[PDB]
Amino acid sequence: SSVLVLGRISDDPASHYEQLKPLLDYVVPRMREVGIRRGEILMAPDARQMSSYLRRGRVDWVSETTGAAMLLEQRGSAHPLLMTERGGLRDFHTLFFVRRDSPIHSLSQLRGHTLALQNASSTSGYLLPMLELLRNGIACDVLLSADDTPARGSAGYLMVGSKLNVAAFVHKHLIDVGALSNVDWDDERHMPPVFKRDFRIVHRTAPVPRAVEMVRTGMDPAVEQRLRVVLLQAASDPKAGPALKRFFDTTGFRPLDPTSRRRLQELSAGVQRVRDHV
């Protein structure tokens, strides 16, 4: 508690370290008056491991998309500090896409077909699309490999890891349907135009808030309130501009308000339902 530890869920810590260190370097000196003297970065491979870090006090603060953030809240390990705006957008949503020449035109026609998802900690690439399928009564069994096939009447899903893989697998006719966020859709690292032109969007989910700053269970209340004040004033500090760009292009932070609290409550119910029935 003389150290502030920032992290995130990361399948690529070599790359993501640089996203975190600049804002941490900005924050730490502004926290002296609450006993912080130094900073550290600690990332984890998935929500379950990050949750264990959080609960054990090894990580203090993470910035995550809201579904992942609810996984951490449900596991007893953290709570919301601030709503976060990235790329100028407060919200995002999941889209389902196929090859243009696919016979699939709606979400219901997933029955009989395969779906490329990301990993269990993804909001837009796992939690939201699985929630959507549960709501529509569309069964979706885990498939073991690209040779495996769904039951008739059911869909099936394959975990391919990365967002690009979701695009690549559907493009190359290995899986029928992909799930990515509407923001991922226009991001060329995740959805190359050479694949994108061969795709058609078949369904959109309702939006959720894009991201949230979470802090661990049992953080000292003085540290928590000061971190909040620091981050709230960073967005208008020019001294924080480059750091924020690097921190997932964060363009805003704001207080939790009754609306955002209720939306997180709704999303958390949905995430809990996904976890209970997957």
Q: What is the dihedral of CA 68, 40, 29, 215, to 10 degrees?
A: 30
In the complex, minimum distance from the CB of residue 194 to Cl ion, in angstroms, rounded to a whole number: 35
Going by the DSSP 8-state scheme, the letter that residue 200 receives in this structure is E
**At a CB cut-off of 8 Å and minimum separation 6, what does 104 contact?**
98, 110, 113, 176, 177, 202
For position 209 contacting Cl ion by CB under 5 A, the verdict is yes
In the complex, minimum distance from the CB of residue 92 to Cl ion, in angstroms, rounded to a whole number: 12
For position 94 contacting Cl ion by CB under 5 A, the verdict is no
> Alpha carbon 47 to chain centroid distance?
10
Q: Which residue is nearest to Cl ion (CB)?
A: 260
Stretch that binds Cl ion, among 72-80, 148-156, 259-267, 268-276 (CB under 5 A): 259-267
Stretch that binds Cl ion, among 73-81, 168-176, 237-245, 260-268 (CB under 5 A): 260-268
For position 84 contacting Cl ion by CB under 5 A, the verdict is no
String of b and e for 48-87 (b: at least 16 CB within 10 Å)?
bebbebbbeeebbbbbbbbbbbbbbbebebbbbbbbbbbe
Strands 94-99 and 199-204: antiparallel
In the complex, minimum distance from the CB of residue 262 to Cl ion, in angstroms, rounded to a whole number: 8
In the complex, minimum distance from the CB of residue 263 to Cl ion, in angstroms, rounded to a whole number: 5
Stretch that binds Cl ion, among 63-71, 156-164, 205-213, 219-227 (CB under 5 A): 205-213
What is the contact mask toward Cl ion in residues 35 to 54, using x (rule: CB under 5 A)?
A: --------------------
Binding residue for Cl ion, selected from 10, 65, 121, 260, defined by CB under 5 A: 260
Q: Look up residue 209 and give its two tokens.
A: 């808030």
Stretch that binds Cl ion, among 4-12, 36-44, 104-112, 206-214 (CB under 5 A): 206-214
Question: Of residues 179-198, which lie at the interface with Cl ion (CB under 5 A)?
Answer: none
Whether the CB-CB separation of 38 and 2 falls below 8 Å is answered with: yes
Stretch that binds Cl ion, among 15-23, 73-81, 125-133, 209-217 (CB under 5 A): 209-217
Stretch that binds Cl ion, among 41-49, 169-177, 184-192, 201-209 (CB under 5 A): 201-209
Rounded CA gap, 261 and 192, in Å?
35
Q: Which is closer to Cl ion, CB of 205 or CB of 260?
A: 260
Q: Which is closer to Cl ion, CB of 80 or CB of 209?
A: 209
In the complex, minimum distance from the CB of residue 209 to Cl ion, in angstroms, rounded to a whole number: 5
Greatest extent of the chain over all pairs of C-alpha atoms, in Å: 63
Rounded CA gap, 223 and 13, in Å?
26
In the complex, minimum distance from the CB of residue 208 to Cl ion, in angstroms, rounded to a whole number: 8
Strands 94-99 and 177-181: antiparallel
Neighbours of 46 (CB within 10 A): 15
Whether the CB-CB separation of 10 and 53 falls below 8 Å is answered with: no
**Residues paired with residue 215 on neighbouring β-strands, in sequence order:** 61, 79
Q: Which residues bind Cl ion (CB under 5 A)?
A: 209, 260
